[PDB]
Design a protein around this nucleic acid. Structure first.
Length: 136
RNA sequence: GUUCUAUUUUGUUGGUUUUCGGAACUGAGGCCAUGAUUAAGAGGGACGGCCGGGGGCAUUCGUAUUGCGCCGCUAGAGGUG
């Protein structure tokens, strides 16, 4: 919550691990090595309904809570890690990904670099489901 | 040359093996236009390089999933129309 940095000289950098699932929106702010984190508020905490924890409404509210909480410390430069479900499951980011990318800069924080660190398998195991799949 | 014999035969009577006619063995020959059609827009096999997620054995690398050990923050995380 205290920053000994000078405002005019440099900006304190950081990274964000934005997990985009089909039923939740995880945004996770940690420091440049990733061991010691800062703040993690989800899209399921901002809405009192499990149906819309990956809705675009839920994702941009989590960015504002990150924007309000991290402003107390002083980290304005924020790198971005876009992470999908990965593995044998889908590698496509969920619908609550772009809006989490979209709101937090508008509250006043500065964007670093965007990277895809999705847990993509080289060669994965058997995907969940049978030989016919998730028929419905 | 070796083995055997049908024989015409010794003017008619008794011995003998030759020439005589044959069947087989063996030796030196002469001679033959002296004996082999090609290699299938078929193959077999060889040779020489190249080619193959071809096979088997050993070796090596790579995420990912699950779980464990350590650290930081958390009241929600999963799942579904």
């Amino acid at each position: 919550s205290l920053g000994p940095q000078v405002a005019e000289g440099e900006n304190v950098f950081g990274v964000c691990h934005i997990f985009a699932s089909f039923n939740d929106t995880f945004v996770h702010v940690t420091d440049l090595s990733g061991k010691e984190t800062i703040c993690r508020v989800t899209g399921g905490m901002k809405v009192k309904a499990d149906r819309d924890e990956s809705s675009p409404y839920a994702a941009m509210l989590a960015a504002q809570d990150v924007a309000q909480r991290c402003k107390e410390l002083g980290i304005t430069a924020l790198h971005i890690k876009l992470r999908a479900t990965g593995g044998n499951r889908t590698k496509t980011p969920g619908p609550g990904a772009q809006s989490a990318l979209r709101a937090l800069a508008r509250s006043g924080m500065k964007i670093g670099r965007i990277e895809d660190v999705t847990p993509i398998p080289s060669d994965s195991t058997r995907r969940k489901g049978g030989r016919r799949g998730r028929r419905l």
